[PDB]
Amino acid sequence: LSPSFGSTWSTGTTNAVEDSFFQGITPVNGTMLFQNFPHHVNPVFGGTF
Amino acid sequence: LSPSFGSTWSTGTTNAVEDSFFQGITPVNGTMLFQNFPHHVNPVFGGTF
Amino acid sequence: LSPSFGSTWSTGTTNAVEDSFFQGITPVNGTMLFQNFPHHVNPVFGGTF
Amino acid sequence: LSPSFGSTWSTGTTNAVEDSFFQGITPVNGTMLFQNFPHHVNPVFGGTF
Amino acid sequence: LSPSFGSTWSTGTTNAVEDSFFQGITPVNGTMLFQNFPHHVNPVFGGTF
Numbered sequence: 042l043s044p045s046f047g048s049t050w051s052t053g054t055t056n057a058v059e060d061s062f063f064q065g066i067t068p069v070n071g072t073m074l075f076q077n078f079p080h081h082v083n084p085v086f087g088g089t090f
Numbered sequence: 091l092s093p094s095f096g097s098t099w100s101t102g103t104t105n106a107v108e109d110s111f112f113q114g115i116t117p118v119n120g121t122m123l124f125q126n127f128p129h130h131v132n133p134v135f136g137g138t139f
Numbered sequence: 140l141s142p143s144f145g146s147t148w149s150t151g152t153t154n155a156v157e158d159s160f161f162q163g164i165t166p167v168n169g170t171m172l173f174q175n176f177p178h179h180v181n182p183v184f185g186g187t188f
Numbered sequence: 189l190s191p192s193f194g195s196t197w198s199t200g201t202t203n204a205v206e207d208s209f210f211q212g213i214t215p216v217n218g219t220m221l222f223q224n225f226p227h228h229v230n231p232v233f234g235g236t237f
Numbered sequence: 238l239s240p241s242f243g244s245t246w247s248t249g250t251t252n253a254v255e256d257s258f259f260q261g262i263t264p265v266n267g268t269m270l271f272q273n274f275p276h277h278v279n280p281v282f283g284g285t286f
Binding site: 189190191192193194195196197198199200201202203204205206207208209210211212213214215216217218219220221222223224225226227228229230231232233234235236237 | 238239240241242243244245246247248249250251252253254255256257258259260261262263264265266267268269270271272273274275276277278279280281282283284285286
């Protein structure tokens with residue numbers, strides 16, 4: 042087994058605020074927990090032309 | 091097993107504010123916990139032209 | 140096992156404010172905890188042209 | 189096992205304000221805790237052209 | 238096990254204000270704690286052209 046991946050690219054802004062990244066061989070046997078609950082937030086997101 | 095990865099690239103701004111990165115062989119057997127709960131926040135995000 | 144990674148590159152600004160990086164063989168058997176909760180914040184993020 | 193990594197590169201500014209870096213073989217068996225909670229902050233982030 | 242790393246490079250400014258670096262074999266068995274909470278701060282960050 043020999044997977045081939047591609048490069049990751051970006052030209053404009055990239056606002057990766059609050060997240061988690063992994064890469065490469067990552068065997069898991071224990072426990073991994075991901076829970077998310079903000080409870081007073083008023084976001085705004087923009088469109089495009 | 092011999093995975094091949096690509097380079098990571100960016101030309102514009104990259105505002106990686108609050109996050110966690112991993113790379114390479116990272117076996118896990120214990121516990122990993124990720125929990126997120128901001129509770130008074132008013133974000134704004136921009137669009138494109 | 141012999142993974143091959145690529146270089147990490149950046150030309151513009153890179154505002155890595157508040158985060159954690161790992162690289163290389165990092166076996167884990169204990170506990171790792173990541174929790175995030177700012178509670179009075181008014182961010183702004185910019186778009187592109 | 190013999191992973192091969194690439195160089196880390198930057199041409200423009202790099203404002204790594206408040207963070208933690210690791211590199212190389214870093215086995216962990218105890219506990220590692222990461223918690224973040226600023227509670228009166230008004231950031232601004234810039235876009236690109 | 239014989240990982241091979243690359244050089245770390247920078248041409249422009251590098252304002253590494255408030256952070257912690259590690260390199261090389263760093264086994265950990267006790268406890269490591271990282272907590273961050275500034276509570277009256279008004280940062281500004283710049284974009285690119």
